[PDB]
Design a protein around this nucleic acid. Structure first.
Ligand SMILES: [Zn+2]
Length: 139
DNA sequence: GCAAATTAAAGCGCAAGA
DNA sequence: TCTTGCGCTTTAATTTGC
């Protein structure tokens, strides 16, 4: 809602402060005071808008000569929901074959199949192996 | 200007329960 | 035999001071 020429940095900031996961991935915000640029929903802490600018992507911010927040850089912004769509597919595999399939996931994060469920809840937000079971019950 | 210290939050690991 | 909830720790970034 209310979008300037594809960069209402004014509300983008309202998104950065509002931690709107819907502006995450769409733009970043670079605080020159610290030389960092986070997503609109950074979970570490914040600096005034003053030294804060916005970028279409983290690479643009990365191009401003800033250090991407190790909290907002490794995780996914709007791409977050897309990586969560991938996990749902993980549910299919856990109900598609007979033996459960987490080996590719567990190896990717370096954790057991139960912790993969814990990740499914972390990203989805509140349902690890239970989200796997529900999806499988409706899929 | 440059640094250190603090606060905040997320997620991993552990446990217990069913 | 399998599962899920909760806690705590660690990580990270921000703020202020001189
Ligand atoms: Zn951040």
């Amino acid at each position: 809602m209310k979008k300037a020429t594809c960069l209402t940095d004014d509300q983008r900031w309202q998104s950065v402060l509002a931690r709107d996961p819907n502006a995450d991935g769409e733009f970043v915000f670079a605080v020159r005071t610290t030389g960092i640029f986070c997503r609109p929903s950074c979970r570490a802490r914040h600096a005034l808008r003053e030294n804060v600018s916005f970028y279409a992507n983290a690479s643009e911010a990365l191009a401003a000569g800033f250090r991407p927040c190790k909290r907002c850089q490794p995780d996914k912004a709007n791409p977050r929901q897309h990586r969560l769509d991938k996990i749902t597919h993980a549910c299919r595999l856990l109900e598609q074959e007979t033996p459960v399939t987490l080996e590719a996931l567990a190896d990717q994060v370096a954790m057991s199949p139960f912790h993969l469920h814990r990740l499914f809840k972390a990203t989805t937000g509140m349902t690890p192996k239970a989200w796997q079971q529900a999806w499988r019950a409706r899929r």
